Design a protein around this ligand. Structure first.
Ligand SMILES: Nc1ncnc2c1ncn2[C@@H]1O[C@H](COP(=O)(O)OP(=O)(O)O)[C@@H](O)[C@H]1O
Ligand SMILES: Nc1ncnc2c1ncn2[C@@H]1O[C@H](COP(=O)(O)OP(=O)(O)O)[C@@H](O)[C@H]1O
Ligand SMILES: Nc1ncnc2c1ncn2[C@@H]1O[C@H](COP(=O)(O)OP(=O)(O)O)[C@@H](O)[C@H]1O
Ligand SMILES: [Mg+2]
Ligand SMILES: [Mg+2]
Ligand SMILES: [Mg+2]
Lengths: 372, 372, 372
């Protein structure tokens, strides 16, 4: 009868739907807005706070505030609000009937899972739930059983090396360089040309510019030398009001930070080094099989030409007597949700849900003992 | 109708097959491994422990453990498991019909044979069984009937002098220096160059390096002096992950342990002295015939140039007026199994099986009174 | 006239001083720091690299990097720099006059000692030098002459059984678990509570937390059970900027990796097992004395209550009819240097130095022929 409810709870977007499908049904930004002006107009259905896609449409008035920051939820009051919205106004189902499946980034605060389970068992009264790691669901979706995954969302970037089904918990690195940092860096470096973006609403415009105009350069120095005699690199974008801007070497300087994290003045290894370091933390016999299965998930890994530079850069580190392959699917943006649907549809998994009667016995602490 | 089922269940490898052939059918390592990680997957065909050549392919996960140590069985529970594997998954033959011939090392604990007979007669319900010594079977395979044999496997090294059909049980020396100590010594002296191997998985890599890169030097001092100006001795080996290691005078230092057991910190005489002492313990009238028949069996004796040094070394001890010949058959690695096949094929031997109804009357104590 | 210079150059700190004393004069962390920022300020005496305590004072800017890792020296250029620092800027003596006494861990790559000899005989032009083992020097300072020493520093942990003046080279175990691994594990498990430390500058902060706030539990299960109803276990530590942090059952979980190394997911026996296995590798006639003389040295062995658990754990392994004693001195942190001073002060030891004229004839290879 009832099957599941699979909702990937990212930092940027709330991707959600039913189990067993090939694509999520609801995809909206995870923001909640609150008005900040006089509001002298009468009627017109003025609500206290606009959440989801409606907030993005009217951003010129409200002050957007993301409830999820760096993967850790910090505004639980708004979080239950956005969950209520996605369950009622977007799917139009009763959450009390269908079990739900959730996702969380690894090495996360321990209280976060407890409070998530408590909220989903008290306010919504679901029958069952389960918390999964995104990096294993991506490899679920990819269809293989062994490999190393480089997830890269909006707030957190991490690796999980997994052999033929056996995870290695001591090789799970996690760096806090993600999409929001790139957006901030682009906003900062656009000032050199003359354009200044400050308001929370203009952060969305800068994010859109990054989404629709940025690419990863295969060779940074040669690209800079070419941009010195700037002929065919500059592009044009149209602001909502009508002004046209031109960005040149900012096109490939912004996404490079993933490879040279010193551009934001933080001493860390780029995404091409954390993968290699996480591979080198496993015992020697499996590095050959890990090298040949590199899976890219997450939205931030969707820049053009990222895979080519990842190959060209990792090949410089690994020994020369072996091959390296990266496996970017064209539909990686919903890889976590696809994997969650695949896991929820399985028959063997039906015994791993957390029953309500089980939770009443042991309290919210059951999540650590049962889920992982 | 039925002929036999002989399996040279040594310490290192389990060599098994049918009588009357010229080579065994199943040759696999005698290791049983158990995983050590949580296994976040689902399904994928889990066994609690992988036995035989399957475990050797997944050593990146498990903690391999040899059930047989120094010839003496220590972990019967896995011993019956690997015997079950041998009978079913590799030979595909019903043990309830074919009689089996087992082998053991001399000067072994009394309880070992008793437990072996009890397990074979209760768990597998064989009709007949018999336990023989490796050193006589290797001579049997060699085809002669008078000579002294130096067996050297993975856990035990021993000598058994045989005159014309008559053994000499009062002159059977046995030193516990074997291949495993050589592997550990190579692991220890490889740290001098810089490479450190610790886990059970890397012991296999070190063992393979020993197998395909070590040799026995005729004159140790001259070889060291040559290695002082190291030009044409060093070789290269490629590790599973890609790194290449170079080992120089570590090549001939490892297998010299058999000749100077003081390298591994034990007060004992080498294999070039135990054979001589065993020969000198027999009466004077057979030493001339024993000196001319030296049969080398077992895997450990497969180093290049071992026979030549053995000859040059025993010649120095024996009187100068008589000759020495060390017969090193080419296939000696399977000599014990060949001899077991020859012994089980013969018609005369068919009266010395231990019938099940005979075992019922007297219990498992029949093995000592009947086998030897 | 001239007496000696004992410079115990361990992995974590460089403890140095003169012979004949009861405590070293120089104790500073063994790091070298390099700036990474704009440096727009003029003057102020900005140096290229800060070495020693000065770097530890300005960690907010520099990128600290240890030149010695796991006892093996990897950055010789920085190592000679810190040697020049300790010789000139702290002791204020001319190295060309006084002889120096160095120390190193056993089972180290051969090239380390040779390069140490070359550096000390070419760059500084010392008259004579000698290299010792920490484990024997700690027993030397302890005052006895028969016992088993468990040295456990910052990079290496090794055991050396000693009978009445005769060392047993075939029973020197060595596991690579030390204080740095504990610091990394504490950094990783602090993220469960919510505190994230990534910067190399914050590793020092975590190390200070570990030094001043953690202890070894006698019974792990009972301590966890009491921590379930956490009342009197949490303690408060103040960060340099002003925030306070509170850790509960994290106080005793970090030092429990010494005894259960499976927490870092590496396959080795705990320090209570390597000592016992090293005892069991010796001949049967010295174990009774080895049991009753257990000497602990090194900084890592200074956790409160380590001796009680070590005794309770070794008693459970040894035969029940013979007694176990552990001898932790109150000042065991400097025991290696105290032993070095004692050894260099003696008159009989005067004939074992490596003379410069002797080194010229034979080159840097003399260390292996003379020292050990
Ligand atoms: N075409 C694109 N180019 C660059 N970045 C993109 C693009 N599309 C999405 N992104 C980035 O991906 C992120 C959204 O991914 P998301 O679905 O939130 O994954 P997760 O839910 O795991 O965080 C956004 O932060 C955005 O910056
Ligand atoms: N080519 C080789 N070079 C050196 N040693 C070898 C070689 N082949 C096998 N060995 C050694 O021989 C041993 C295998 O002998 P094995 O068949 O187990 O004798 P048994 O069955 O009597 O124990 C292994 O432990 C290995 O160390
Ligand atoms: N009070 C303490 N509690 C716990 N650990 C300590 C304490 N004091 C020092 N240590 C540890 O001791 C180590 C320093 O020992 P060290 O003098 O470097 O030995 P060695 O010089 O032989 O390496 C450091 O890694 C530190 O973690
Ligand atoms: Mg995602
Ligand atoms: Mg053999
Ligand atoms: Mg120390």
């Amino acid at each position: 009868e009832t099957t599941a409810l699979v909702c990937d709870n990212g930092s940027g977007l709330v991707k959600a739907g039913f189990a067993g499908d090939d694509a999520p049904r609801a995809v909206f930004p995870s923001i909640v807005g609150r008005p900040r002006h006089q509001g002298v107009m009468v009627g017109m259905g003025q609500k206290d706070s606009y959440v989801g896609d409606e907030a993005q449409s009217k951003r010129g008035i409200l002050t957007l505030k993301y409830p999820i920051e760096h993967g850790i939820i910090t505004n639980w009051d708004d979080m239950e609000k956005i969950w209520h919205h996605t369950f009622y106004n977007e799917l139009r189902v009763a959450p009390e009937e269908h079990p739900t499946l959730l996702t969380e980034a690894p090495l996360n605060p321990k209280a976060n899972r407890e409070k998530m389970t408590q909220i989903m068992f008290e306010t919504f009264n679901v029958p069952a739930m389960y918390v999964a790691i995104q990096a294993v669901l991506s490899l679920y979706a990819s269809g293989r059983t062994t490999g190393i995954v480089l997830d890269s969302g909006d707030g957190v970037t991490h690796n999980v090396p997994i052999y033929e089904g056996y995870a290695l918990p001591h090789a799970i690195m996690r760096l806090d360089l993600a999409g929001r940092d790139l957006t901030d860096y682009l906003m900062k470096i656009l000032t050199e040309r003359g354009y200044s973006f400050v308001t929370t609403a203009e952060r969305e415009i800068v994010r859109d510019i990054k989404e629709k105009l940025c690419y990863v350069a295969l060779d940074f120095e040669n690209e800079m030398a070419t941009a010195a005699s700037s002929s065919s690199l500059e592009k044009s974008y149209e602001l909502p009001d009508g002004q046209v801007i031109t960005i040149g070497n900012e096109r490939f300087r912004c996404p490079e930070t993933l490879f040279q994290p010193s551009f934001i003045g933080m001493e860390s290894a780029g995404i091409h080094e954390t993968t290699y370091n996480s591979i080198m933390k496993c015992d020697i016999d499996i590095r050959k099989d890990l090298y040949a299965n590199n899976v890219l998930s997450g939205g931030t890994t969707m820049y053009p030409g990222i895979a080519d530079r990842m190959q060209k850069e990792i090949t410089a580190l690994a020994p020369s007597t072996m091959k390296i392959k990266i496996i970017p699917p064209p539909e990686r943006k919903y890889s976590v949700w696809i994997g969650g649907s695949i896991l929820a549809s399985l028959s063997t998994f039906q015994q791993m849900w957390i029953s309500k009667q089980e939770y009443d016995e042991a309290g919210p602490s059951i999540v650590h003992r049962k889920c992982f």
